[PDB]
Task: inverse folding
């Protein structure tokens, strides 16, 4: 009736501080502005599917997901995984519309937050591998809850 | 698979040059950036329904329509007309999201175009009632086709 539709925007961003799993998949729920992030070793169709399985457990099942035309997003595999879930897959709108901004602003806020927290803990370079998960979870908490 | 979802934004704007039917209903198709406009004497639930019946004949049936919470848009009547068509009705997204900009930019472009054309025809004030329809159709053509 009157309330925003459940549409996500998803993207991958590189963050070397999180190596070897430095590919962060980030999903913004445009209905709630909630942010979900997971880390991956590579940007593959399967990484994107694992990320969305996690996002679905946390946010529920969306009506549609917007991405760019990255191959992990347009592969037969990913097309079939989304069909299996009954989730529509869409993309940017034409007419010189420059970029799904929200997930892009999120990428930036996220990388800043990771940096601030890391440097606070005394990691000026790569975050030790055993510390990464809690730090990523803490940045996600900070970006969503207050 | 990969292409933009069929979501419209609809709004009413007042344009005294078009009196007595000075309420212009404007619909932008975010998938194609096409603009549909009709004129009305009042902003009622029925005016909104007549506008969308026209927009559907011209653009096809959308998956959802975004409006503000104006009463012509949230009435039981309009809620039922949209249900009858199987069209979802939604609204702005939270998080300090200030306004469905696209249909708002359209309103502005439309009123400018009407002014330019009217003054070109020598109407510096109200457009004579018998001339209004073709002039409105000409502004719509100008905003969409080239
Ligand atoms: C459903 C809907 O209205 N979506 C949208 C509304 C507006 S707005 O300017 O009107 O706020 C802008 C949008 C921009 C893009 S993108 O091409 O940059 O990715 C995609 C959308 O889906 C947009
Ligand atoms: C489906 C989708 O992505 N929609 C959208 C994408 C973006 S964008 O900044 O990411 O381009 C901005 C949007 C803004 C609004 S509104 O509150 O101003 O009306 C509504 C949308 O629906 C938007």
Result:
């Amino acid at each position: 009736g009157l309330g925003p539709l459940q549409i996500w925007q998803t993207d991958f961003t590189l963050e070397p501080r999180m190596a070897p799993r430095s590919w962060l998949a980030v999903t913004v729920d445009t209905a709630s502005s909630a942010i979900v992030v997971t880390q991956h070793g590579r940007v593959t169709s399967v990484a994107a599917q694992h990320h969305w399985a996690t996002a679905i457990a946390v946010l529920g099942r969306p009506k549609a997901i917007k991405t760019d035309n990255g191959s992990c997003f347009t592969s037969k595999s990913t097309r079939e995984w989304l069909a299996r879930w009954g989730i529509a897959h869409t993309t940017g709108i034409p007419g010189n519309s420059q970029g799904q901004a929200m997930v892009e602003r999120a990428n930036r806020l996220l990388k800043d937050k990771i940096r601030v927290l890391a440097e606070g803990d005394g990691f000026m370079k790569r975050i030790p591998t055993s510390k990464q998960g809690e730090l990523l979870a803490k940045a996600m908490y900070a970006l969503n809850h207050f």
